[PDB]
From a paper:
Here we report a third nitrile biosynthesis strategy featuring the cyanobacterial nitrile synthase AetD. During the biosynthesis of the eagle-killing neurotoxin, aetokthonotoxin, AetD transforms the 2-aminopropionate portion of 5,7-dibromo-l-tryptophan to a nitrile. Employing a combination of structural, biochemical and biophysical techniques, we characterized AetD as a non-haem diiron enzyme that belongs to the emerging haem-oxygenase-like dimetal oxidase superfamily. AetD seems to be dimeric; each AetD protomer has a 7-helical-bundle architecture, which comprises three core helices that house residues responsible for coordinating the diiron cofactor, and four auxiliary helices.
However, we were able to obtain a substrate-bound co-crystal structure of AetD at 2.08 Å resolution, which displays an excellent omit map density for 5,7-dibromo-l-tryptophan in the absence of iron. In this structure, the carboxylate and amino nitrogen of the substrate, which coordinate Fe1 when iron is present, now hydrogen bond to the Fe1 ligands H79 and H172, pre-organizing these residues for Fe1 coordination. Thus, the three ligands that exclusively coordinate Fe1 (the amino acid moiety of substrate, H79 and H172) are all positioned for Fe1 binding when the substrate is present. Diiron bridging residue E176, and Fe2 ligand H179, on the other hand, are part of a highly flexible region of core helix α3 (E176 to T183) and are disordered. Of the residues that bind Fe2 (D76, E140, E176 and H179), only D76 of core helix α1 has good omit electron density. In AetD, the substrate binding pocket is more accessible in the apo state when side chains are not positioned for metal binding and core α3 is unwound.
Numbering used by the authors: -6 to 175, 184 to 239
């Protein structure tokens, strides 16, 4: 009924429209293609190395503010305690997939900072820069947009992930349903109102978040096309 609640609902509906467009990217059709072996489809998994530990830091140090009495910021802090745990899931599955290979320190560094992973590596950086001077209600819009994009990615990746978990009888934690199925942010947002200026800013936020996620998926697609002869090697980690 109140005008402030209609504006919030418009932003939450905008997130759904971006999600619908985001799900149609060709990278997700490849990852979901059951006719290609799941090891081949997960060749892009090491690309996430340029993201996952930065996402841990985004939650520990950029989103979180332990010295805050604000009601919304304390909800955000609770959310960050969950998401800051997931980098260990990424490293768990990196080893299970046979991608935790021995190499020179400089090869690991040149991989993470590769120009082919520029958008992947800078996603959390751009989010932190965008979020720094945001009031907590706008930070929540950032987090909700980010969580929606992320669920699209891991619903897709959980398909070849759970196929390998079943075919090898090993417990996957990151490309796995348990990660997908993890007072939520969306529940608080639906009860909260936005001012007129906040609705304009929230549109800019949602547009930027899904643009940077789309750039990241674009890099994943180019990476697959450059590594068609390679695949995960789960047997190397037995
Ligand atoms: N659930 C993921 C977080 C996440 C959220 N958004 C993401 C995007 Br957009 C791309 C990638 Br790769 C990962 C994410 C995690 O916990 O590490």
């Amino acid at each position: 009924v109140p005008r402030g609640s209609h504006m919030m609902k418009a932003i939450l509906q905008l997130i759904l429209e971006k999600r619908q467009e985001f799900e149609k990217l060709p990278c997700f059709e490849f990852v979901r293609d059951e006719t290609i072996s799941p090891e081949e489809r997960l060749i892009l998994y090491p690309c996430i190395a340029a993201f996952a530990l930065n996402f841990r830091d985004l939650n520990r140090y950029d989103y979180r503010d332990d010295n805050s009495s604000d009601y919304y910021q304390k909800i955000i802090n609770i959310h960050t305690q969950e998401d800051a745990k997931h980098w260990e899931w990424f490293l768990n599955d990196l080893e299970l997939l046979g991608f935790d290979k021995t190499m020179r320190f400089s090869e690991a560094l040149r991989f993470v900072w590769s120009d082919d992973l520029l958008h992947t590596r800078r996603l959390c950086h751009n989010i932190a820069v965008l979020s720094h001077d945001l009031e907590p209600v706008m930070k929540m819009v950032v987090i909700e947009a980010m969580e929606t994009a992320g669920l699209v990615i891991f619903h897709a990746l959980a398909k070849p992930g759970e196929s390998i978990a079943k075919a090898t009888r090993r417990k996957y934690l990151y490309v796995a349903d348990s990660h997908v199925e993890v007072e939520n942010i969306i529940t608080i947002l639906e009860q909260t109102q936005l001012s007129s200026e906040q609705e304009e800013k929230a549109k800019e936020i949602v547009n930027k978040v899904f643009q940077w996620s789309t750039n990241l998926i674009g890099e994943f697609e180019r990476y697959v096309k450059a590594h068609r002869s390679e695949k995960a090697q789960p047997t190397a980690a037995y």
